């Protein structure tokens with residue numbers, strides 16, 4: 001189990017434009033295309049991202065390419081972030097995956113706003129952080145995914161992804 005498998009489980013894989021849990025146009029493995037309500041806008045963004053006229057659909061290889069770029073961007077974003085970097089450096093490898101997952105889902109900005117939880121993670125107060133993390137819109141909107149991620153932070157194991 002590694003970050004790619006983890007996210008593949010949480011995001012799934014769709015080769016045609018679809019709407020994510022928030023109603024935004026997305027494709028592949030959770031690759032957000034646009035927050036705009038225009039499907040044409042999304043189709044444009046798609047073509048631009050892939051480098052060809054896709055007409056709303058892509059191949060598995062294309063999906064995977066986007067996925068690699070996205071994971072790379074999330075990690076890179078974490079490392080450039082003054083509030084995120086220290087936490088990421090302080091965590092073990094498994095727990096670092098949980099942080100990357102959050103950033104992939106909600107962006108650097110979103111995550112950087114979980115100040116209190118971040119501080120608790122930095123201090124390695126696992127149960128305390130887990131409770132704090134659950135007091136959020138994130139947990140209330142996507143509870144199953146949030147539970148998996150929170151369990152990962154709490155335990156430092158892949159148990160929540162075992163049998164999925």
Ligand SMILES: [Cl-]
Pocket residue numbers: 134135136137
């Ligand atoms: Cl709440």
Ligand SMILES: [Cl-]
Pocket residue numbers: 141142143144145146
């Ligand atoms: Cl969920």
Ligand SMILES: [K+]
Pocket residue numbers: 088089090091092093096
């Ligand atoms: K680390």
